[PDB]
């Protein structure tokens, strides 16, 4: 017996850091009644198999940490200290400030007289770190109070991915899952440092190599990832589209595409309208006045049924494939090598290694994150990779996919619960001011007259109605539709997002900010603008584990509390292992975790903080009245609580949804109150509620499928690592999306040794088939209007095909592919700042470091902010390895330890050496001592530009 664990209760949990979703085992003193005594990995968990990176490994020290908040704190306007206070004080006083600001600012109708029922004097930040039930309840609270300025992490992380992959495949999510990486024949990691930033992924990447895969790292820096790859290939920052363009030309020139896949499953055969053209860097329909495009000019030529025309022979010169061949002929190896600064030899090696997966019985995968998403390219960059993956027949197959690596543990789930300004839960758009009725809202959904296009989004009316029923069960959906706030139709959609919220804040056009599980005083670009801007708030609600640079902006560097009139409430939430609920991993796996210890001190789950806060707003409205109270009074919170606290279970069941009455649907009979078994049984008529149609099938009458921990697998499932009885993923336990494309028209896999689905005795066997129907009867991309993987994407702002427009303004003066230098849809480049700053992560720290700067073992490994430079820039500026350096820019300056390393090398741009300097953004002024402040003192706020910004570096 191990004494340490002998008298402790053992529970399972899920890592609270990155989106791999590692399994934990927690040991709690006094058989549950005390503090946590131990946290290590869950050896039965099929993702990590007991392994933890140092973030997961150190979760004991995160939880049992004497620096953690114990009770609410109050900061008085112009005050220079905190005063500890009661929950009941801070919540009631908070509930007041909400009602005050709302009643004062609430607008029933915009300038144009359209119903909107909203307030623009309160904004909310966060959070990808709360449980899925907390995210869903949080969103619905903010929307009953009529907020529209609702945002989190997701907008900087992966806001390019969702539209790029939705354009390409019809869904925004990572296409495969972590275990499936082991099935790849070639793994390309580009715009990702997965060995440091998704470490347990490397379990499966290295198992892929064991089975004969080539691993390829394409990065401007040599990293811990590069050290364990077969091919390291340097690429200068922002040259990715030239790189992926060459690969597209390489695949066509050499006839390495999967022809049958391309013919049948992509839009290769669709005929584009004669209005489509491209010349000297501009597609047709361009308007030079507005710096904007007329996408109608790109539409497909339609048959007399409304259905896009098709030449299955692929002969017609307006075939997508023929237009694509023509567009990418300009991307030859000499131009591509020149601009990427990657040798011709290395480009040839990578192209050959990756295009070899064009073979039916070979699969290649791309892994990317912020190296792609935080450049200006970003969307067209991800479009290029998707197009390559469709050319090679890599989408729907084991070891294939686009593996868009999500960041935070529940950023997938926070996104799914609509914690962005443009989406409700389930990705139903926030109605705009011109959507004056639910009928109009539903009329905006595109239709298809193609009998083979499933076109699943046509079921939207059932989801939106079921949603409105979940919030407002005693109202008709058409009536409930007037409670929720709307955005202006006449307005730039980005005017509601992160970057603009900070611009609005700095013009004092907000009274209140919720900083809920986010640290913007370190996270947002141009920290100095933001730290000032937060002073122009009247009140601030910060909900976090520890006091931080956000809660305490008012006593930060060069700030005088006396000057600063902002009233701050600090509410201490509990850690992941102190509460129950679900987090959704990058693979879409929705995983249940349990309470180990009771909340430290007087900390509360976020679900209790926000529910109680809303109860104090509700009764404040019920006693005093005020602005349009019905949406607050009418909201069904009864279904969210049990024994006087937030109920994760109950909230989860409401998200899945249940029949509000005795109902017949899809020719089955259902009893009132019965749990909804799948989104296929939701109705538009109010028979059914569901907080999120994606969650329908997650908590059925069968039980909580998210809490399953069953490793049962058929031979075919176990061959590729589906683990369908471990937890649950949306939609309806489809582990690999678009898997209908993994088989021919008879239902036989392209690669029988690695089948995802197979047609056997009149049924699909293996994964859950992504869309019902017999083999050869349905187009495989069911969320697409037309049913196809889009090579040609006529709904994308920058044009239907990715095109290289120079992301780097300052050091690049000419484009080798056109006469359009920059993106045809302001950086000063002051010569005092001659080097290219970039920010990025290390394995040991997390985000702004709020969490990891408070764990002694993580600071031990990585105690201070560093600046990585080449020997060339070291020799030039006379900097020695370990010297203190000042890094500066138009926005700010800071101090950092020099790491001189051959792992950085200067870019060769237009004849001249360009030096790139690297900083981590894991540092802030609060803690630890000599740690340093954020790298975002240096970055500009012009989804912002954090992977390339002009600095100088000097020895102190």
């Amino acid at each position: 017996e191990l004494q340490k664990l002998q008298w402790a209760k053992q529970t399972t949990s899920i890592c609270c850091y990155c989106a791999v979703g590692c399994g934990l085992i927690v040991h709690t003193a006094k058989d549950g009644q005390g503090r946590a005594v131990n946290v290590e990995g869950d050896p039965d968990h099929p993702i990590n198999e007991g392994s933890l990176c140092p973030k997961g490994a150190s979760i004991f020290q995160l939880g049992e940490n004497d620096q953690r908040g114990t009770q609410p704190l109050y900061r008085a306007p112009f005050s220079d200290t905190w005063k500890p206070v009661t929950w009941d004080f801070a919540l009631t006083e908070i509930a007041k400030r909400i009602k005050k600001t709302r009643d004062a600012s609430f607008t029933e109708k915009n300038a144009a007289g359209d119903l909107v029922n909203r307030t623009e004097a309160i904004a909310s930040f966060g959070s990808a770190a709360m449980d899925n039930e907390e995210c869903w309840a949080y969103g619905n609270i903010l929307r009953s109070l009529g907020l529209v300025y609702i945002e989190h992490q997701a907008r900087i992380x992966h806001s390019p991915t969702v539209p790029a992959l939705a354009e390409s495949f019809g869904r925004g999510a990572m296409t495969n899952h972590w275990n499936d990486l082991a099935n790849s024949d070639c793994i390309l990691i580009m715009g990702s440092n997965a060995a440091e930033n998704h470490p347990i992924a490397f379990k499966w990447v290295l198992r892929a190599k064991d089975k004969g895969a080539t691993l390829i790292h394409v990065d401007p820096r040599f990293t811990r990832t590069s050290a364990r790859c077969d091919v390291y290939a340097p690429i200068r920052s922002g040259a990715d589209i030239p790189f992926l363009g060459g690969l597209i030309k390489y695949i066509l020139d050499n006839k390495l595409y999967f022809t049958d896949y391309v013919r049948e499953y992509t839009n290769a055969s669709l005929i584009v309208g004669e209005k489509f053209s491209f010349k000297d860097g501009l597609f047709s329909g361009y308007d030079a006045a507005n710096k904007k495009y007329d996408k109608s000019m790109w539409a497909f030529e339609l048959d007399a049924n409304g259905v896009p025309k098709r030449d299955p022979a692929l002969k017609h010169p307006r075939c997508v494939i023929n237009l694509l061949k023509k567009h990418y002929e300009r991307y030859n190896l000499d131009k591509v090598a020149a601009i990427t600064g990657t040798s011709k030899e290395q480009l040839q090696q990578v192209y050959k290694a990756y295009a070899a997966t064009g073979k039916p019985d070979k699969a290649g995968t791309i892994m990317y994150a912020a190296g792609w998403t935080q450049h200006s390219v970003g969307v067209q960059n991800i479009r290029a990779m998707a197009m390559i993956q469709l050319l090679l027949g890599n989408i729907g197959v084991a070891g294939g996919g686009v593996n868009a690596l999500r960041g935070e543990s529940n950023v997938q789930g926070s996104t799914d619960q609509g914690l962005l300004a443009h989406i409700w839960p389930g990705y139903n758009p926030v109605p705009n001011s011109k959507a004056a009725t639910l009928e109009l809202y539903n009329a905006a959904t595109p239709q298809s007259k193609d009998p083979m296009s499933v076109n699943w989004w046509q079921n939207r009316p059932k989801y939106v109605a079921s949603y409105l029923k979940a919030l407002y069960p005693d109202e008709e959906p058409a009536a409930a539709y007037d409670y929720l706030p709307r955005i202006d139709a006449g307005r730039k959609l980005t005017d509601y997002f992160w970057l603009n919220i900070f611009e609005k804040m700095d013009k004092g056009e907000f009274k209140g900010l919720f900083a809920w599980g986010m640290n913007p005083a370190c996270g947002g670009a141009n920290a100095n603008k933001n730290r000032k801007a937060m002073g122009k708030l009247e009140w601030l609600v910060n909900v976090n584990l520890f006091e931080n640079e956000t809660s305490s902006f008012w006593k930060g560097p060069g700030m005088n509390p006396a000057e600063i009139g902002t009233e701050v409430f600090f509410l201490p939430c509990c850690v992941s292992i102190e509460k129950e609920g679900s987090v959704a991993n990058s693979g879409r796996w929705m995983q249940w975790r349990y309470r180990g210890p009771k909340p430290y001190a007087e900390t509360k789950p976020d679900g209790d903080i926000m529910l109680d806060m809303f109860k104090k707003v509700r009764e404040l409205y019920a006693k005093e009245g005020g602005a349009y109270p019905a949406p607050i009074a009418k909201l069904n919170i009864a279904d969210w609580e049990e024994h006087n606290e937030f109920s994760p279970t109950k909230v989860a069941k409401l998200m899945n949804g249940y029949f509000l009455k005795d109902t017949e649907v899809g020719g089955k009979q259902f009893k009132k109150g019965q749990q909804v078994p799948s989104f296929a049984f939701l109705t538009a008529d109010g028979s059914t509620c569901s907080g999120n149609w994606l969650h329908a099938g997650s908590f059925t009458d069968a039980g909580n499928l998210m809490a399953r921990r069953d490793k049962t697998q058929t031979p075919e499932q176990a061959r590729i690592g589906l683990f369908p009885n471990w937890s649950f993923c949306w939609p309806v336990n489809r582990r690999i999306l678009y898997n209908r494309a993994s088989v021919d028209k008879t239902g036989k896999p392209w690669n029988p040794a690695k089948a995802v689905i197979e047609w056997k005795d009149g049924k699909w066997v293996g994964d859950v088939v992504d869309g019902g129907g017999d083999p050869g009867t349905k187009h495989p991309f069911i969320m697409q209007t037309h049913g196809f993987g889009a090579l040609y994407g006529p709904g994308r702002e920058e044009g239907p095909f990715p095109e290289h427009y120079e992301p780097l303004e300052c050091p690049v003066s000419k484009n080798p592919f056109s006469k359009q230098l920059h993106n045809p849809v302001k950086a000063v480049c002051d010569p005092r700042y001659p080097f290219i700053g970039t920010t990025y992560r290390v394995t040991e720290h997390w985000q702004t470091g709020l969490m990891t700067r408070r764990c002694a073992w993580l600071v031990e490994a990585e105690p201070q902010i560093f600046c990585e430079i080449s020997k060339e820039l070291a020799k030039l500026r006379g900097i020695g390895n370990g010297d203190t350096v000042k890094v500066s820019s138009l926005r700010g300056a800071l101090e950092a330890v020099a790491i001189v390393t051959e792992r950085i090398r200067p870019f060769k741009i237009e004849g001249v050496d360009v030096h790139m300097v690297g900083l981590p953004w894991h540092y802030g002024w609060m803690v630890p001592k000599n740690g340093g402040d954020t790298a975002n003192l240096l970055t500009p706020s012009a989804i912002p530009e954090t992977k390339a910004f002009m600095v100088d570096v000097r020895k102190v």
Partner: protein, 214 residues
């Protein structure tokens, strides 16, 4: 009867093992500063039983050979540290018959710790400047006796860390050296008949660390 096989051709220098050593034994963190390396702590100490050493080596073309060395007592089949301390006070250093673990006891405060370190051809032993106790990796002998993997092994996600019966671990090292040599032609096993922690290096062990091998 137990051996670690440590395949350094699989290490991501994620430093799971380093953190997981401390979490399991509830060791404290050192005062550290960055002196121009990711490496930290810079060396083994009375409170650090394992650190990951980083070495950057030049190579022709893009990139570097970045050598990662997660250092621990090798649990020698013939402990020189015992031999040294056994002639000052026998019992201060012990060998577990069961596991093969070499263990430093509370009685190491009553020897020439300093000279027990010198006997160590791997420069592993470390001294408490107060109690004069000697500390080092104890093989998680606790957990092994209970039939748990050692913390540093269970935590490692890459397949670098491996543990079990000598026969099975030697067999595996043999077989894995053969496959790894296909990618890293100069791959060798560290002192594979002398020790119970058998490192696979991708090249000259001395590039990973001065005291990598005897």
């Amino acid at each position: 009867g137990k051996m670690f096989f440590v395949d350094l051709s699989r290490c991501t220098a994620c430093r799971g093992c380093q953190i997981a050593c401390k979490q399991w034994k509830n060791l404290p963190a050192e005062e550290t500063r960055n002196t121009g390396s990711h490496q930290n702590p810079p060396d083994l100490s009375y409170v650090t039983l394992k650190t990951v050493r980083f070495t950057e080596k030049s190579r022709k073309g893009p990139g570097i050979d970045w050598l990662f060395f997660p250092e621990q007592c090798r649990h020698c089949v013939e402990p020189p540290c015992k031999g040294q301390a056994d002639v000052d006070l026998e019992g201060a250093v012990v060998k577990d018959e069961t596991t093969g673990a070499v263990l430093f006891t509370e009685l190491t405060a009553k020897v020439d710790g300093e000279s027990v370190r010198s006997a160590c051809p791997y420069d592993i032993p470390r001294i408490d400047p107060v109690t004069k106790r000697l500390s080092k990796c104890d093989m998680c002998n606790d957990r092994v006796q209970n039939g748990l993997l050692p913390a540093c092994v269970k935590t490692c996600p890459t397949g670098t860390m491996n543990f079990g019966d000598e026969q099975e671990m030697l067999a595996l090292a043999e077989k894995r050296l053969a496959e790894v040599k296909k990618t890293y032609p100069g791959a060798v096993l560290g002192d594979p008949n002398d020790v119970r922690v058998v490192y696979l290096f991708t090249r000259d062990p001395k590039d990973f660390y001065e005291h990598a091998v005897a």
